Symmetry: D2
Subunit: 483 residues, 4 copies
């Protein structure tokens, strides 16, 4: 069983904790990210084959600490940054000299040299280890780079193995998870899919399941999962909310109605969304509106069915994790998956690459990209602008060099040449970013020649657009979307 060998990752608040989880996932082992403030009851219920304590911005000199069971549970424990500093007490690029044999790092040598010692290229106080620990690696600024009670199988590392900059970090996480915690590598996209199917089948039986099909990654893979498990019993509602991209409805239907043979209720709700949105300039109002009409449309569509006892949903593990930060049943095949696993299993389920590695598209769609009041003519204009932008972006092989690209409609009038020189028309902003984390994203240094080709195209080819600007504001101090 694929959840059997499982890592409990305890989050002391690093931005890299989910990266550790994703690395364990990549290594083929289930794992779970909980907050540090967990009860020995819970760790005993999860029953981890090993524990991992993640980095932290706090300090053990105040203060987040592991539930003492972490070290009493008799499973190998791996501390990382804070997780190492908290393992003690409770018991930029750099190179560490391996000063001892440890289970964790034996055989793993990036450079050696030192003339008589193994070196580790790692990506990086602890004044003294517990009495049962040895020093395993050391640096100038950190004599305690790796510490280990190799008998109790506790390991401590002042660097981040989950990050690629740690030359052999993954081999180290492999060592801890596969070899020191003797975990089998059962958590494979093929076997996740079988687990998904089995669990949906068992949880829903012959009951009818409904699902909001966006065409996006999460609800698509969910569609494919539900569909593989209960076939025709699944009904997907595709709402064209009048806020999608150019031809999005066609593409979602060509893909999932035709190509994959899904049972699709197609709801053309453009006028209805644009109705409810009428005269609404407040971006948070628009979101709530757009989100409410969606819930309205699905509940209407659900009733037109019958015996629909289950709503399916593209909830992925990160979503569960924020919810962790404090009618119809829920079918959530992806609740345990991170986004890269979802894509990977989407590939195995047969979905196309393009869709799976597409830029995220917001729920509210163009509703948050038409500044202020959302009008059809602004959305049609926005659509042709985005289409050109994204089509040029794809020609130039720039689509994968940015996390997200789109255009924003500015309801301001600017003059542009018409032939005699007298036509005001609308302005759009191109927006392209390289996303670093949920808090920070850089605006993309798209090439000048390229920007200008897109500019000219949008202005010349779209009647109603006279001027194109580029969002040159990063996040912070701005955000990715304009609303």
């Amino acid at each position: 069983n694929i959840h059997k060998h499982r890592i409990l990752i305890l989050d002391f608040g690093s931005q890299y904790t989910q990266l550790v989880a994703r690395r364990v996932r990549e290594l083929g082992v289930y794992c779970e990210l909980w907050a540090w403030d967990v009860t020995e009851a819970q760790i005993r219920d999860f029953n981890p084959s090993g524990i991992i304590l993640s980095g932290g911005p706090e300090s053990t000199t105040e203060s987040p600490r592991a539930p003492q069971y972490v070290f009493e549970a008799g499973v190998p424990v791996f501390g990382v940054c804070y997780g190492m500093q908290t393992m003690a007490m409770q018991l930029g690029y750099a190179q560490v000299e391996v000063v001892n044999d440890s289970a964790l790092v034996r055989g793993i040598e990036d450079a050696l040299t030192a003339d008589g010692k193994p070196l580790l290229d790692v990506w990086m106080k602890v004044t003294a280890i517990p009495s049962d620990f040895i020093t395993v690696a050391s640096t100038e600024s950190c004599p305690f780079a790796i510490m280990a009670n190799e008998e109790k199988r506790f390991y401590g590392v002042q660097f981040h193995p989950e990050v690629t900059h740690t030359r052999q970090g993954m081999r180290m996480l492999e060592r801890f998870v596969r070899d020191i915690c003797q975990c089998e590598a059962l958590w494979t996209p093929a076997k996740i899919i079988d687990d998904a199917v089995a669990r949906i089948r068992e949880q829903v039986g012959d009951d009818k399941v409904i699902l909001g099909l966006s065409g996006g990654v999460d609800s698509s893979v969910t569609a494919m999962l539900l569909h593989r498990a209960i076939g025709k019993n699944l009904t997907c509602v595709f709402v064209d909310n009048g806020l999608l991209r150019l031809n999005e409805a066609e593409q979602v239907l060509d893909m999932f109605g035709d190509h994959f043979g899904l049972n699709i209720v197609h709801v053309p709700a453009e006028d209805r969304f644009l109705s409810a949105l009428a005269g609404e300039n407040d971006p948070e109002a628009k979101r709530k509106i757009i989100g409410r009409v969606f819930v309205e449309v699905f509940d209407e569509e659900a009733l037109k069915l019958e015996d629909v006892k289950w709503l399916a949903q593209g909830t992925i593990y990160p979503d569960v994790i924020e919810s962790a930060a404090s009618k119809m049943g829920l079918v959530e095949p992806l609740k345990e998956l991170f986004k890269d696993e979802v894509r990977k299993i989407g590939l195995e389920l047969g979905l196309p690459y393009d869709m799976l590695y597409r830029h995220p598209f917001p729920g509210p769609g163009l509703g948050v990209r038409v500044l202020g009041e959302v009008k059809k003519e602004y959305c049609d204009l926005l659509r042709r602008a985005d289409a050109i932008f994204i089509e040029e972006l794809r020609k130039a092989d720039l689509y994968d060099k940015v996390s997200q690209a789109f255009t924003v409609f500015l309801p301001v009038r600017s003059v542009g040449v018409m032939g005699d020189g007298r036509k005001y028309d609308w302005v759009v902003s191109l927006r392209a970013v390289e996303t670093i984390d949920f808090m920070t994203a850089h605006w993309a240094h798209l090439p000048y020649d390229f920007l200008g080709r897109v500019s000219n195209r949008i202005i010349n080819e779209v009647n109603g657009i006279s001027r194109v600007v580029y969002d040159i504001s990063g996040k912070p101090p701005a955000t990715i979307e304009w609303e």
Copy 2:
């Protein structure tokens, strides 16, 4: 000493480069005028040129060749020179081989051929030259790249010598205007100033003159010329319309009031222009209001002054050329824009001010899209200041023709400590201008753009997001309105 004694008639055959040719002639210190090609024997005879230039189916007046003065045809001018004297015409860097001796290019060599023959590096068609002309230079594509009737002192070149791409073009221009045409170079900043003062004094005498002092290049140099000519008898009216750059009023007042001793009437009229603009969204109406309120204010101040008999004005020669179908002092009406700067330097004005990017008459009124409001103008001024501050630090101010900031009355979200706040967006706009019809948006460095947008969003309370106008002209325009 008439600095207009030696003069060059340049006939404009519609080329972009014709005002370039005239400026080159003015750079050699020789006065010249640029007329439309369609002139009369009479119009030309009255000018009495020391030499005629024809720029790049229109035809020169037959008198141009009858006039007995040297004539220089460039591109279309050389082609039209061939047509009209019995030749024949049929329609990038290049090198023309000089194949005959000619006053125009005698001694002007850029390289030598393998044969050992002279070559000209030029920037650029005739198939038969008149029977009294010879072939001066040629190249593979252009059999007749330079031709000359050495006797009538007629010279045609297919390339443009006014463009520095023609390696020694200026020297051929110098050769025709100074040697062939027999011109002294008295047209100098210092002497143009003297002649401007002389002509102002003679036309105005002891009368008091009034002047609209916009702070721009033209009205400033006009102000300094008048102040030099008539001093206390000059009142400049400076009108802060509410649409000027940050501290423009203080700056113009500092400069001409305290520093230069001009007599200034400062009209703080921000509320007045803003109020005449309240609610107006149409840029055509905004400009008309701003212009309308401008003369109203200026008229109300001209009636506030005893014995004002003359209006001074920074009309420059291109304004005169562009104009092609109380007394008026226009000291700059013969000067091209760079000449006006050169003399503004000799009159003691500051370089920064003379080479400043042009600012439009309505100012921020065409840069706050829609209803111009004080709030938006305030934000715009701060953002714009940060932009130019940085442009100058980066030595990029020199590198664009115009750089400014447009206020977009759209709300965008941005970070506000731990959460979010909606505020206004501005667009940076920077162009390299090419002509009245053509401008490329500047490829400002990315790092620089990032600094500026950070500076604006972080430093300007009320701005959350900054975009860069990446639209060229055409299909867009330089200004947003």
Copy 3:
């Protein structure tokens, strides 16, 4: 057994054929790359779980052109034809090719096949599956179905599902084929039903087992160069027969700075190997004395090293085995012989070297030629020239690594130029040349467009810091018309 599931890959002459092989290896499945001109007895003896017929430049329309042995299609195993492999399978099975004396291409999947079922990169506006492939046939066999199409290429993919014959006109082995690896995975793991036992941990365990069966308690001589193959080899025999393995490391005086100290400290003082160290600097130098001919120097360096190695070998009799780092590419291009790496490709040797415990930086270090500095010192090889070269090269590589440029080139090194150049406090000293290449194939190398300020930095460090070097130049000559080494 980790060779049980195995893919026979027949080589029809493509450049990318070794890449097909290594992708099967990357997949976790043993495979073998043979010339196409083999026999049924050979295939039968090999017992493929599946056969891949790879690309090739020749035309199927020519007179005596390559054909797959007819048994390929009678082995009752799956057959995968890639490009010419597919053109030969179509021609050998009833269909036709027209001849025509590369590119990115999107092929539309127009029918189901086990090979590309569910492998999609995009949809057409008409809902049809698209594959992003690295492209390169007028009729297919009449038991074959068309699987995918292009404009240019009507039969991009053909297949006989019953017989498990799949032909593609693109290169799944090339990363440009977006889901190439998946199709190869599909063929090998799903269709050929191979397990992924070909792993580094298991290839090591296999290596050890096969050394012990072959050698037992016998004694084994090895030439330890510190290079990648000789060293992983040493680790395998050592993990296999400990003290019964002896490593002869000859410091020929033509090695990089402190190479002897480093080879010895690492494999003797850290991996507990038993190494006889021939400190043979003066002997190689004496032999090379007065030889300005690169060909003659290569010989001389070869001759002496054999002489030295033989002498050290005789000195430990009752040794019946010479071990050697020969790797699978050596096999493909070509006391008793022990060769643990003879089935491994270079990146496997590296991968298993990491499992053996070896340092990354050593396993991914640039190749250092047999003659070492004997061929990087133009003309007469002298102690002093090698000495300057070693200091110069050490500076170059040190800068090159801290600039994170070692990853970015195939080979970086310094060549000593016996020419005098003026420099400042005015002195005449030697010239060295930096040389850094990006090696496309065996015959093509681009000189690296190393940053200018980096080049200027390396260049100043070498001049200022190496007493004896007045001037640094950079080889801006690619292969062809020049070669990688200078001699």
Copy 4:
């Protein structure tokens, strides 16, 4: 016409920018001489400057033996302009005081001075005039002499400009001669044309006319020989003498086998078949190669080439009866660095030589060619000079320059050439290999006599040239690029 009548004395205190001052004043149309600071009142009285400019320098007036102007500088009754050090020694030598301590800066003008009245680059917010100047942040005047006034200042430079308006003494802590001082030229012109009242009679056309007249009055109708090398200096000298004494000028062009590809023909085609000079063309390639045979020492090679050049020239001289005059192209920098002698360019800087060269009819690209050393390929062929090597180098170099001109990179460098390395490398030949010579491309952006940076030529450009030389020149296996700056290396390899 006396075109030297007005003249500025520049006293060199050692600034890297002193030559620039001299050329700016020249550019303004006013003759000027550049002397060392330690000259004598006597010498200055002889020159009789219309005005004196004291340049900057690296020394410090606060140090014991620091350079000072001849006191007469301040007693000659002419305007004195002091630039940095010259300002600081003007202060100190007049009762000021300097304290011991380059960049852009804005000096605020605070008093009227003939030097900068009307010269303004910006204003302060407070509305006060600013000059944009290129300053030396080093030593600073902290007291100005009694009858001086502060003209300009910064928060860090109380006396950024000082002036004694009556004595026409001006000191600036910045460099008006460098472009980075926005209106420095106008400052220099203000001093030279206005305050010193120099007429701008030092123009190319007038310099020519003056040279001619000085030639025609030094030699009259005598015969004059001239080593013509096609280099800028002797070419301009040749044309001066041609216009001056015409037929009596005999030009000797020596092809020493160390010239660039076809150089003899293009020099012959140019100055013989086109400009009409009388060229005695000596083909002495075998004579130089012979004398050079077996000489691997670059210092010996240079002496040999020098010596052998002189014998050839003396012989050609002997073949002409009554050669009473030797013309050379010595330019003023050669004087500053240091048969009757005619040196028409001894007062001219290199740009002035080009400028008058163009006025004489010489082609631009010749006048602006990179400097070619006197020994030619003999110091670009490393070790022993042989014809096979020079033929190679010539072919290789001409490819180099041809491409360099094509890509508009020729004028982006001060010198570009190829060095023949007597080292052999292997290369591809067909399917097998070949073994042939190596050449080095060498290209520099020269900043001064002691500083050259190697050019960041475009990689694709380098590889194109690379391939061309190797694929087009027989005898070359490989091309390298010199990536050594000067210092620690030199421009030439030998």
